[PDB]
PDB file of C-alpha atoms and ligand atoms in Angstrom:
ATOM      1  CA  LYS A  11     111.181  31.932  52.096  1.00  0.00           C
ATOM      2  CA  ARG A  12     112.513  35.817  51.034  1.00  0.00           C
ATOM      3  CA  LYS A  13     112.188  40.055  53.012  1.00  0.00           C
ATOM      4  CA  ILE A  14     110.596  42.359  51.098  1.00  0.00           C
ATOM      5  CA  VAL A  15     109.545  46.079  51.217  1.00  0.00           C
ATOM      6  CA  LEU A  16     106.391  46.826  50.373  1.00  0.00           C
ATOM      7  CA  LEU A  17     104.574  50.308  49.501  1.00  0.00           C
ATOM      8  CA  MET A  18     101.799  50.353  50.755  1.00  0.00           C
ATOM      9  CA  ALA A  19      98.701  53.694  51.118  1.00  0.00           C
ATOM     10  CA  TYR A  20      95.716  54.795  52.933  1.00  0.00           C
ATOM     11  CA  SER A  21      92.166  55.831  53.856  1.00  0.00           C
ATOM     12  CA  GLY A  22      92.512  55.866  58.020  1.00  0.00           C
ATOM     13  CA  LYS A  23      88.685  56.573  58.710  1.00  0.00           C
ATOM     14  CA  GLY A  24      87.493  53.233  60.300  1.00  0.00           C
ATOM     15  CA  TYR A  25      90.871  52.186  62.044  1.00  0.00           C
ATOM     16  CA  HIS A  26      92.237  52.996  64.783  1.00  0.00           C
ATOM     17  CA  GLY A  27      96.020  53.090  63.193  1.00  0.00           C
ATOM     18  CA  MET A  28      98.427  50.944  61.992  1.00  0.00           C
ATOM     19  CA  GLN A  29      99.969  49.231  64.199  1.00  0.00           C
ATOM     20  CA  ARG A  30      97.644  46.889  67.375  1.00  0.00           C
ATOM     21  CA  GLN A  31      89.160  49.986  69.267  1.00  0.00           C
ATOM     22  CA  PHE A  32      88.340  49.080  65.676  1.00  0.00           C
ATOM     23  CA  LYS A  33      90.268  46.650  63.808  1.00  0.00           C
ATOM     24  CA  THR A  34      93.751  48.289  62.113  1.00  0.00           C
ATOM     25  CA  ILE A  35      95.797  48.241  58.749  1.00  0.00           C
ATOM     26  CA  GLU A  36      98.371  45.530  59.914  1.00  0.00           C
ATOM     27  CA  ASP A  37      94.668  43.311  60.382  1.00  0.00           C
ATOM     28  CA  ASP A  38      93.781  44.527  57.105  1.00  0.00           C
ATOM     29  CA  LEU A  39      96.780  43.671  55.553  1.00  0.00           C
ATOM     30  CA  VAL A  40      97.386  40.320  57.737  1.00  0.00           C
ATOM     31  CA  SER A  41      93.897  38.489  56.972  1.00  0.00           C
ATOM     32  CA  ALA A  42      94.876  39.737  53.466  1.00  0.00           C
ATOM     33  CA  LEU A  43      98.465  37.795  53.411  1.00  0.00           C
ATOM     34  CA  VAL A  44      97.078  34.861  54.493  1.00  0.00           C
ATOM     35  CA  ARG A  45      94.313  34.079  53.031  1.00  0.00           C
ATOM     36  CA  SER A  46      96.839  34.991  48.891  1.00  0.00           C
ATOM     37  CA  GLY A  47      98.322  31.802  51.167  1.00  0.00           C
ATOM     38  CA  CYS A  48     101.916  34.516  51.634  1.00  0.00           C
ATOM     39  CA  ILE A  49     102.327  33.771  55.038  1.00  0.00           C
ATOM     40  CA  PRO A  50     100.982  30.766  56.848  1.00  0.00           C
ATOM     41  CA  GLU A  51      98.679  31.420  59.321  1.00  0.00           C
ATOM     42  CA  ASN A  52     100.623  31.191  62.801  1.00  0.00           C
ATOM     43  CA  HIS A  53     102.863  34.017  61.325  1.00  0.00           C
ATOM     44  CA  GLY A  54      99.903  35.952  61.338  1.00  0.00           C
ATOM     45  CA  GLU A  55      98.761  35.683  64.812  1.00  0.00           C
ATOM     46  CA  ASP A  56     102.562  35.964  65.729  1.00  0.00           C
ATOM     47  CA  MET A  57     104.079  38.765  63.600  1.00  0.00           C
ATOM     48  CA  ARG A  58     107.670  38.339  64.235  1.00  0.00           C
ATOM     49  CA  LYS A  59     107.884  35.207  62.469  1.00  0.00           C
ATOM     50  CA  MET A  60     107.866  37.412  59.150  1.00  0.00           C
ATOM     51  CA  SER A  61     109.950  39.804  60.334  1.00  0.00           C
ATOM     52  CA  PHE A  62     107.663  42.035  61.564  1.00  0.00           C
ATOM     53  CA  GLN A  63     107.645  45.731  60.638  1.00  0.00           C
ATOM     54  CA  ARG A  64     106.512  49.269  60.320  1.00  0.00           C
ATOM     55  CA  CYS A  65     108.153  52.460  59.601  1.00  0.00           C
ATOM     56  CA  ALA A  66     104.827  54.850  61.013  1.00  0.00           C
ATOM     57  CA  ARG A  67     102.748  53.957  63.482  1.00  0.00           C
ATOM     58  CA  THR A  68      99.458  55.958  62.561  1.00  0.00           C
ATOM     59  CA  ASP A  69      97.713  57.108  64.412  1.00  0.00           C
ATOM     60  CA  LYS A  70      94.120  56.695  64.661  1.00  0.00           C
ATOM     61  CA  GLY A  71      92.276  58.111  62.116  1.00  0.00           C
ATOM     62  CA  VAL A  72      95.136  59.191  59.760  1.00  0.00           C
ATOM     63  CA  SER A  73      95.502  58.341  56.336  1.00  0.00           C
ATOM     64  CA  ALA A  74      98.557  57.388  54.623  1.00  0.00           C
ATOM     65  CA  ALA A  75      99.826  57.720  50.673  1.00  0.00           C
ATOM     66  CA  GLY A  76     103.350  55.767  50.951  1.00  0.00           C
ATOM     67  CA  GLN A  77     102.940  53.298  53.904  1.00  0.00           C
ATOM     68  CA  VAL A  78     106.206  51.411  54.218  1.00  0.00           C
ATOM     69  CA  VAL A  79     106.110  47.746  55.595  1.00  0.00           C
ATOM     70  CA  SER A  80     108.842  45.116  55.602  1.00  0.00           C
ATOM     71  CA  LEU A  81     108.165  40.662  56.082  1.00  0.00           C
ATOM     72  CA  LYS A  82     109.217  37.876  54.645  1.00  0.00           C
ATOM     73  CA  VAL A  83     107.236  36.048  52.995  1.00  0.00           C
ATOM     74  CA  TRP A  84     106.166  33.548  49.725  1.00  0.00           C
ATOM     75  CA  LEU A  85     107.390  35.126  46.590  1.00  0.00           C
ATOM     76  CA  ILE A  86     104.082  34.523  45.140  1.00  0.00           C
ATOM     77  CA  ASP A  87     103.308  34.551  40.819  1.00  0.00           C
ATOM     78  CA  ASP A  88     100.867  38.071  40.875  1.00  0.00           C
ATOM     79  CA  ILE A  89     101.925  38.409  44.478  1.00  0.00           C
ATOM     80  CA  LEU A  90     100.719  41.724  43.786  1.00  0.00           C
ATOM     81  CA  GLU A  91      97.364  40.807  42.246  1.00  0.00           C
ATOM     82  CA  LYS A  92      96.758  38.431  44.884  1.00  0.00           C
ATOM     83  CA  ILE A  93      97.429  40.613  47.801  1.00  0.00           C
ATOM     84  CA  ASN A  94      94.317  43.600  46.568  1.00  0.00           C
ATOM     85  CA  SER A  95      92.772  40.993  46.128  1.00  0.00           C
ATOM     86  CA  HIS A  96      91.651  39.963  49.634  1.00  0.00           C
ATOM     87  CA  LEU A  97      91.078  44.016  50.134  1.00  0.00           C
ATOM     88  CA  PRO A  98      88.788  46.971  50.517  1.00  0.00           C
ATOM     89  CA  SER A  99      89.086  49.686  48.166  1.00  0.00           C
ATOM     90  CA  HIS A 100      90.552  52.089  50.590  1.00  0.00           C
ATOM     91  CA  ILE A 101      93.973  49.410  51.491  1.00  0.00           C
ATOM     92  CA  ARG A 102      96.116  48.794  48.109  1.00  0.00           C
ATOM     93  CA  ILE A 103      99.397  48.066  48.172  1.00  0.00           C
ATOM     94  CA  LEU A 104     101.035  50.066  46.025  1.00  0.00           C
ATOM     95  CA  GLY A 105     104.563  47.944  45.580  1.00  0.00           C
ATOM     96  CA  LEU A 106     106.584  45.272  45.954  1.00  0.00           C
ATOM     97  CA  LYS A 107     110.762  44.886  46.073  1.00  0.00           C
ATOM     98  CA  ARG A 108     113.274  42.681  47.471  1.00  0.00           C
ATOM     99  CA  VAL A 109     116.415  42.962  50.497  1.00  0.00           C
ATOM    100  CA  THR A 110     118.749  41.441  52.157  1.00  0.00           C
ATOM    101  CA  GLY A 111     117.591  40.224  55.167  1.00  0.00           C
ATOM    102  CA  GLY A 112     119.180  42.497  57.556  1.00  0.00           C
ATOM    103  CA  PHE A 113     116.989  45.154  56.665  1.00  0.00           C
ATOM    104  CA  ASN A 114     114.509  46.831  59.211  1.00  0.00           C
ATOM    105  CA  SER A 115     112.616  49.299  57.258  1.00  0.00           C
ATOM    106  CA  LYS A 116     112.121  51.463  60.764  1.00  0.00           C
ATOM    107  CA  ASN A 117     115.259  51.039  62.449  1.00  0.00           C
ATOM    108  CA  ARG A 118     116.135  52.507  58.357  1.00  0.00           C
ATOM    109  CA  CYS A 119     114.664  54.737  56.992  1.00  0.00           C
ATOM    110  CA  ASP A 120     115.539  59.523  57.860  1.00  0.00           C
ATOM    111  CA  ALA A 121     112.686  61.501  57.274  1.00  0.00           C
ATOM    112  CA  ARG A 122     108.886  61.258  56.772  1.00  0.00           C
ATOM    113  CA  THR A 123     106.349  64.048  54.943  1.00  0.00           C
ATOM    114  CA  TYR A 124     102.975  64.789  55.957  1.00  0.00           C
ATOM    115  CA  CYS A 125     100.503  66.669  54.626  1.00  0.00           C
ATOM    116  CA  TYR A 126      97.334  67.723  56.201  1.00  0.00           C
ATOM    117  CA  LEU A 127      94.015  68.220  54.499  1.00  0.00           C
ATOM    118  CA  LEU A 128      91.528  70.327  56.385  1.00  0.00           C
ATOM    119  CA  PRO A 129      89.080  73.418  55.999  1.00  0.00           C
ATOM    120  CA  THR A 130      90.267  76.363  55.038  1.00  0.00           C
ATOM    121  CA  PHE A 131      88.222  77.878  58.380  1.00  0.00           C
ATOM    122  CA  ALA A 132      90.314  76.648  60.691  1.00  0.00           C
ATOM    123  CA  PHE A 133      92.211  80.171  59.446  1.00  0.00           C
ATOM    124  CA  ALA A 134      88.785  82.363  59.701  1.00  0.00           C
ATOM    125  CA  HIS A 135      89.773  85.342  62.703  1.00  0.00           C
ATOM    126  CA  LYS A 136      86.808  84.229  65.248  1.00  0.00           C
ATOM    127  CA  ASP A 137      86.083  88.275  65.443  1.00  0.00           C
ATOM    128  CA  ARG A 138      86.228  89.707  61.713  1.00  0.00           C
ATOM    129  CA  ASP A 139      85.380  86.636  59.746  1.00  0.00           C
ATOM    130  CA  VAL A 140      82.285  83.833  59.465  1.00  0.00           C
ATOM    131  CA  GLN A 141      83.358  80.211  60.654  1.00  0.00           C
ATOM    132  CA  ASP A 142      81.631  77.835  58.077  1.00  0.00           C
ATOM    133  CA  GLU A 143      81.574  76.863  54.977  1.00  0.00           C
ATOM    134  CA  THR A 144      80.807  80.326  53.669  1.00  0.00           C
ATOM    135  CA  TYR A 145      84.622  81.414  54.616  1.00  0.00           C
ATOM    136  CA  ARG A 146      86.958  81.934  51.683  1.00  0.00           C
ATOM    137  CA  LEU A 147      90.585  82.248  52.615  1.00  0.00           C
ATOM    138  CA  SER A 148      92.370  85.743  51.603  1.00  0.00           C
ATOM    139  CA  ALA A 149      95.964  86.559  50.846  1.00  0.00           C
ATOM    140  CA  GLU A 150      96.231  88.036  53.975  1.00  0.00           C
ATOM    141  CA  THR A 151      95.617  85.031  55.963  1.00  0.00           C
ATOM    142  CA  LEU A 152      97.361  82.561  54.043  1.00  0.00           C
ATOM    143  CA  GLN A 153     100.166  84.735  54.412  1.00  0.00           C
ATOM    144  CA  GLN A 154     100.386  84.960  58.456  1.00  0.00           C
ATOM    145  CA  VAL A 155      99.780  80.943  57.880  1.00  0.00           C
ATOM    146  CA  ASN A 156     102.649  80.142  56.487  1.00  0.00           C
ATOM    147  CA  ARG A 157     104.264  83.028  58.436  1.00  0.00           C
ATOM    148  CA  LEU A 158     103.414  81.793  61.618  1.00  0.00           C
ATOM    149  CA  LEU A 159     104.886  78.090  60.344  1.00  0.00           C
ATOM    150  CA  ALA A 160     107.416  79.280  58.734  1.00  0.00           C
ATOM    151  CA  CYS A 161     108.747  79.657  61.862  1.00  0.00           C
ATOM    152  CA  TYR A 162     108.974  76.103  62.827  1.00  0.00           C
ATOM    153  CA  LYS A 163     111.411  75.019  60.404  1.00  0.00           C
ATOM    154  CA  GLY A 164     114.836  74.607  61.630  1.00  0.00           C
ATOM    155  CA  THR A 165     115.669  72.787  65.238  1.00  0.00           C
ATOM    156  CA  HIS A 166     114.030  73.514  68.532  1.00  0.00           C
ATOM    157  CA  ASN A 167     112.406  71.630  71.741  1.00  0.00           C
ATOM    158  CA  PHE A 168     109.401  70.486  71.219  1.00  0.00           C
ATOM    159  CA  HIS A 169     108.309  69.380  74.594  1.00  0.00           C
ATOM    160  CA  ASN A 170     104.923  71.330  74.646  1.00  0.00           C
ATOM    161  CA  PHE A 171     103.712  69.212  70.793  1.00  0.00           C
ATOM    162  CA  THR A 172     104.070  65.694  72.810  1.00  0.00           C
ATOM    163  CA  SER A 173     102.306  64.328  75.575  1.00  0.00           C
ATOM    164  CA  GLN A 174     104.544  63.256  78.858  1.00  0.00           C
ATOM    165  CA  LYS A 175     107.398  64.335  77.760  1.00  0.00           C
ATOM    166  CA  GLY A 176     109.798  66.759  80.026  1.00  0.00           C
ATOM    167  CA  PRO A 177     112.199  69.639  78.005  1.00  0.00           C
ATOM    168  CA  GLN A 178     115.430  68.843  79.412  1.00  0.00           C
ATOM    169  CA  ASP A 179     114.583  64.941  77.321  1.00  0.00           C
ATOM    170  CA  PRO A 180     116.944  65.466  74.811  1.00  0.00           C
ATOM    171  CA  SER A 181     114.630  62.992  72.992  1.00  0.00           C
ATOM    172  CA  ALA A 182     112.331  66.128  73.021  1.00  0.00           C
ATOM    173  CA  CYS A 183     114.055  68.355  70.153  1.00  0.00           C
ATOM    174  CA  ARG A 184     113.007  67.457  66.573  1.00  0.00           C
ATOM    175  CA  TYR A 185     113.947  69.167  63.573  1.00  0.00           C
ATOM    176  CA  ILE A 186     111.278  70.085  60.839  1.00  0.00           C
ATOM    177  CA  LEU A 187     113.254  71.099  57.320  1.00  0.00           C
ATOM    178  CA  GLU A 188     110.402  72.241  55.428  1.00  0.00           C
ATOM    179  CA  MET A 189     106.414  73.775  56.702  1.00  0.00           C
ATOM    180  CA  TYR A 190     104.318  75.428  54.523  1.00  0.00           C
ATOM    181  CA  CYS A 191     100.161  76.028  53.065  1.00  0.00           C
ATOM    182  CA  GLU A 192      99.450  75.508  49.902  1.00  0.00           C
ATOM    183  CA  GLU A 193      97.412  78.013  47.627  1.00  0.00           C
ATOM    184  CA  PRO A 194      93.346  76.643  49.109  1.00  0.00           C
ATOM    185  CA  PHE A 195      90.786  75.042  46.381  1.00  0.00           C
ATOM    186  CA  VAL A 196      86.795  74.834  45.878  1.00  0.00           C
ATOM    187  CA  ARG A 197      86.107  71.222  45.967  1.00  0.00           C
ATOM    188  CA  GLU A 198      81.461  71.525  45.866  1.00  0.00           C
ATOM    189  CA  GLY A 199      81.394  74.520  47.137  1.00  0.00           C
ATOM    190  CA  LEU A 200      83.006  73.677  50.745  1.00  0.00           C
ATOM    191  CA  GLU A 201      87.203  75.484  50.457  1.00  0.00           C
ATOM    192  CA  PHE A 202      90.335  73.549  51.163  1.00  0.00           C
ATOM    193  CA  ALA A 203      94.360  73.890  52.261  1.00  0.00           C
ATOM    194  CA  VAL A 204      97.309  71.596  51.720  1.00  0.00           C
ATOM    195  CA  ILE A 205      99.827  72.032  54.829  1.00  0.00           C
ATOM    196  CA  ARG A 206     102.539  70.694  54.134  1.00  0.00           C
ATOM    197  CA  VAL A 207     105.227  69.239  56.665  1.00  0.00           C
ATOM    198  CA  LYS A 208     108.794  67.474  56.600  1.00  0.00           C
ATOM    199  CA  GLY A 209     110.831  66.505  59.510  1.00  0.00           C
ATOM    200  CA  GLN A 210     114.070  64.195  60.747  1.00  0.00           C
ATOM    201  CA  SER A 211     111.153  62.197  62.631  1.00  0.00           C
ATOM    202  CA  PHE A 212     108.169  63.469  64.305  1.00  0.00           C
ATOM    203  CA  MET A 213     106.856  62.408  68.035  1.00  0.00           C
ATOM    204  CA  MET A 214     103.566  61.453  69.147  1.00  0.00           C
ATOM    205  CA  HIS A 215     101.100  64.458  68.349  1.00  0.00           C
ATOM    206  CA  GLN A 216     103.688  66.463  67.536  1.00  0.00           C
ATOM    207  CA  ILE A 217     102.266  67.403  63.712  1.00  0.00           C
ATOM    208  CA  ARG A 218      99.062  67.579  65.289  1.00  0.00           C
ATOM    209  CA  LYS A 219     100.368  70.062  67.734  1.00  0.00           C
ATOM    210  CA  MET A 220     101.844  71.983  65.059  1.00  0.00           C
ATOM    211  CA  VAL A 221      99.053  72.524  63.240  1.00  0.00           C
ATOM    212  CA  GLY A 222      97.260  73.175  66.099  1.00  0.00           C
ATOM    213  CA  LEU A 223      98.461  75.826  67.179  1.00  0.00           C
ATOM    214  CA  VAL A 224      98.853  78.266  64.428  1.00  0.00           C
ATOM    215  CA  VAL A 225      95.136  76.784  64.470  1.00  0.00           C
ATOM    216  CA  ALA A 226      94.385  78.304  67.584  1.00  0.00           C
ATOM    217  CA  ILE A 227      96.718  81.889  67.064  1.00  0.00           C
ATOM    218  CA  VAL A 228      95.387  82.357  63.279  1.00  0.00           C
ATOM    219  CA  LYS A 229      92.165  82.508  64.901  1.00  0.00           C
ATOM    220  CA  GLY A 230      92.974  84.499  67.560  1.00  0.00           C
ATOM    221  CA  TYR A 231      92.139  82.195  70.648  1.00  0.00           C
ATOM    222  CA  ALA A 232      95.367  82.830  71.630  1.00  0.00           C
ATOM    223  CA  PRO A 233      98.329  85.865  70.116  1.00  0.00           C
ATOM    224  CA  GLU A 234     100.583  84.896  68.358  1.00  0.00           C
ATOM    225  CA  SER A 235     104.030  85.105  71.143  1.00  0.00           C
ATOM    226  CA  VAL A 236     102.681  81.771  72.663  1.00  0.00           C
ATOM    227  CA  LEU A 237     104.436  79.857  69.443  1.00  0.00           C
ATOM    228  CA  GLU A 238     108.144  81.268  70.067  1.00  0.00           C
ATOM    229  CA  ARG A 239     107.265  80.589  73.678  1.00  0.00           C
ATOM    230  CA  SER A 240     106.237  77.054  73.312  1.00  0.00           C
ATOM    231  CA  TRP A 241     109.316  76.158  72.218  1.00  0.00           C
ATOM    232  CA  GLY A 242     110.822  77.135  75.310  1.00  0.00           C
ATOM    233  CA  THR A 243     111.478  75.845  78.649  1.00  0.00           C
ATOM    234  CA  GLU A 244     107.425  76.582  79.641  1.00  0.00           C
ATOM    235  CA  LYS A 245     104.487  75.113  79.414  1.00  0.00           C
ATOM    236  CA  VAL A 246     102.014  75.685  77.120  1.00  0.00           C
ATOM    237  CA  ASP A 247      98.876  74.260  76.466  1.00  0.00           C
ATOM    238  CA  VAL A 248      99.005  73.469  72.897  1.00  0.00           C
ATOM    239  CA  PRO A 249      95.681  73.110  71.237  1.00  0.00           C
ATOM    240  CA  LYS A 250      95.410  69.542  68.913  1.00  0.00           C
ATOM    241  CA  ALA A 251      94.055  69.230  65.793  1.00  0.00           C
ATOM    242  CA  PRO A 252      92.026  65.819  64.102  1.00  0.00           C
ATOM    243  CA  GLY A 253      94.016  63.212  63.171  1.00  0.00           C
ATOM    244  CA  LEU A 254      91.682  63.254  60.125  1.00  0.00           C
ATOM    245  CA  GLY A 255      93.072  66.004  57.767  1.00  0.00           C
ATOM    246  CA  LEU A 256      96.249  64.312  58.220  1.00  0.00           C
ATOM    247  CA  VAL A 257      98.041  62.387  55.101  1.00  0.00           C
ATOM    248  CA  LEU A 258     101.805  60.306  55.583  1.00  0.00           C
ATOM    249  CA  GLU A 259     103.174  61.280  52.001  1.00  0.00           C
ATOM    250  CA  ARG A 260     106.491  60.069  51.853  1.00  0.00           C
ATOM    251  CA  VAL A 261     108.676  57.942  53.564  1.00  0.00           C
ATOM    252  CA  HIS A 262     112.214  58.850  52.758  1.00  0.00           C
ATOM    253  CA  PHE A 263     115.590  56.624  52.587  1.00  0.00           C
ATOM    254  CA  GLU A 264     118.190  58.973  50.582  1.00  0.00           C
ATOM    255  CA  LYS A 265     119.829  59.530  54.423  1.00  0.00           C
ATOM    256  CA  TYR A 266     119.611  55.758  53.660  1.00  0.00           C
ATOM    257  CA  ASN A 267     120.720  55.075  49.971  1.00  0.00           C
ATOM    258  CA  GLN A 268     124.422  56.780  50.938  1.00  0.00           C
ATOM    259  CA  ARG A 269     125.205  56.198  54.233  1.00  0.00           C
ATOM    260  CA  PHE A 270     123.998  52.154  54.169  1.00  0.00           C
ATOM    261  CA  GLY A 271     123.694  51.874  50.503  1.00  0.00           C
ATOM    262  CA  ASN A 272     126.872  50.785  48.889  1.00  0.00           C
ATOM    263  CA  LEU A 273     125.411  44.205  52.670  1.00  0.00           C
ATOM    264  CA  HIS A 274     122.410  46.234  51.291  1.00  0.00           C
ATOM    265  CA  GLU A 275     120.431  47.664  48.060  1.00  0.00           C
ATOM    266  CA  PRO A 276     119.400  51.386  47.395  1.00  0.00           C
ATOM    267  CA  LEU A 277     115.866  51.632  47.931  1.00  0.00           C
ATOM    268  CA  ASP A 278     113.322  53.279  46.307  1.00  0.00           C
ATOM    269  CA  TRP A 279     110.070  54.612  45.311  1.00  0.00           C
ATOM    270  CA  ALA A 280     110.153  56.516  42.249  1.00  0.00           C
ATOM    271  CA  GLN A 281     108.462  54.435  39.709  1.00  0.00           C
ATOM    272  CA  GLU A 282     105.292  53.478  41.709  1.00  0.00           C
ATOM    273  CA  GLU A 283     104.557  58.298  42.440  1.00  0.00           C
ATOM    274  CA  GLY A 284     102.074  57.656  40.196  1.00  0.00           C
ATOM    275  CA  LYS A 285     100.280  55.153  41.599  1.00  0.00           C
ATOM    276  CA  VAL A 286     100.959  57.194  44.635  1.00  0.00           C
ATOM    277  CA  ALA A 287      99.393  60.570  43.783  1.00  0.00           C
ATOM    278  CA  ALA A 288      96.393  58.910  42.116  1.00  0.00           C
ATOM    279  CA  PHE A 289      95.713  56.833  45.767  1.00  0.00           C
ATOM    280  CA  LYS A 290      95.667  60.169  47.546  1.00  0.00           C
ATOM    281  CA  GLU A 291      93.034  61.616  45.044  1.00  0.00           C
ATOM    282  CA  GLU A 292      90.844  59.469  44.576  1.00  0.00           C
ATOM    283  CA  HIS A 293      91.032  57.718  48.023  1.00  0.00           C
ATOM    284  CA  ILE A 294      92.393  60.025  50.839  1.00  0.00           C
ATOM    285  CA  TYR A 295      91.127  63.609  49.496  1.00  0.00           C
ATOM    286  CA  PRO A 296      87.542  62.326  48.741  1.00  0.00           C
ATOM    287  CA  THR A 297      87.407  60.655  52.257  1.00  0.00           C
ATOM    288  CA  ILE A 298      88.929  63.424  54.597  1.00  0.00           C
ATOM    289  CA  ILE A 299      86.747  65.981  52.403  1.00  0.00           C
ATOM    290  CA  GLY A 300      83.119  64.203  52.157  1.00  0.00           C
ATOM    291  CA  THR A 301      83.678  63.295  56.228  1.00  0.00           C
ATOM    292  CA  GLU A 302      84.337  67.165  56.951  1.00  0.00           C
ATOM    293  CA  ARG A 303      81.958  67.724  54.842  1.00  0.00           C
ATOM    294  CA  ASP A 304      78.974  65.540  56.403  1.00  0.00           C
ATOM    295  CA  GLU A 305      80.072  64.992  59.187  1.00  0.00           C
ATOM    296  CA  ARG A 306      81.453  68.924  59.521  1.00  0.00           C
ATOM    297  CA  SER A 307      84.485  67.117  61.801  1.00  0.00           C
ATOM    298  CA  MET A 308      87.034  70.178  62.512  1.00  0.00           C
ATOM    299  CA  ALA A 309      83.821  72.423  63.191  1.00  0.00           C
ATOM    300  CA  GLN A 310      82.928  70.519  65.810  1.00  0.00           C
ATOM    301  CA  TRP A 311      86.992  70.769  67.171  1.00  0.00           C
ATOM    302  CA  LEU A 312      87.596  74.305  66.588  1.00  0.00           C
ATOM    303  CA  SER A 313      84.114  74.473  69.345  1.00  0.00           C
ATOM    304  CA  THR A 314      85.789  73.303  72.084  1.00  0.00           C
ATOM    305  CA  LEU A 315      88.764  75.345  70.974  1.00  0.00           C
TER     306      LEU A 315
HETATM  307  N1  LIG B   3     104.910  57.944  64.687  1.00  0.00           N
HETATM  308  C1  LIG B   3     104.687  58.937  65.647  1.00  0.00           C
HETATM  309  C2  LIG B   3     103.359  59.855  65.096  1.00  0.00           C
HETATM  310  C3  LIG B   3     103.899  60.616  63.708  1.00  0.00           C
HETATM  311  C4  LIG B   3     102.592  61.387  63.375  1.00  0.00           C
HETATM  312  C5  LIG B   3     101.905  60.283  62.952  1.00  0.00           C
HETATM  313  N2  LIG B   3     102.602  59.043  62.323  1.00  0.00           N
HETATM  314  C6  LIG B   3     100.985  59.622  63.086  1.00  0.00           C
HETATM  315  O1  LIG B   3     100.536  58.752  64.052  1.00  0.00           O
HETATM  316  O2  LIG B   3      99.706  59.845  63.022  1.00  0.00           O
END
């Protein structure tokens, strides 16, 4: 009866992505919507009768601190609580807002910010450094990482950073506003670092390949010259990092609020930022960290380089 937008978050492990194998995030969401009585059962079976859309089709294993979806529901009392009561702890609806009927979240959002949490031995040189959990990131290596990541900034032909895309395809070009790596931190004897990237839009496997290539370079499996060569017309076999560390941090609506905001209303989750950071630190990060500690996801992939 009313078109709403939802701010939600989830740990991606144990799912096969957001949309569409294991269950998906939307499977849990739909079930929670049906059980709570926000939508009738047929709206859950056919996700078009409630006009359901999602901003980011996060891949298998990928987490999200600020996923955004839009749909029509029965605005039942305490709707946020009710929906959450049918969800596991690792999926939370953080915010809800009533929007105009014509609002399409996927078609209206601009830039996305992702982070990538990884063990620091992903930057350990294969010839000079230890290759296990005992490795500690040096200041010089971090400088190298940030120097390389900075080269991604601006507009480039990113055809080598996805699949089945030609160099002459205009849609292969993408815009990177920012990319860097934060200072490392230790948790339970393991050192991690957070890579953050902001882009106007991303192609399939793009961030994982951007990270993978820099990892290959820093570790010494590829010369630095391959980076600048990668945005040329030539094809480059770019390594694809695991999806475990990848987290969707924010879906931006700044350009939407400017261009459309003045049949449309401004969308802003600034008030829910506390819950966003809380869920990331309490449910997203610890699962990634624990998984790396016990299953050695990154280490296994690094072996294949
Ligand atoms: N929408 C294309 C993919 C973007 C990256 C991230 N959302 C993922 O699927 O892993």
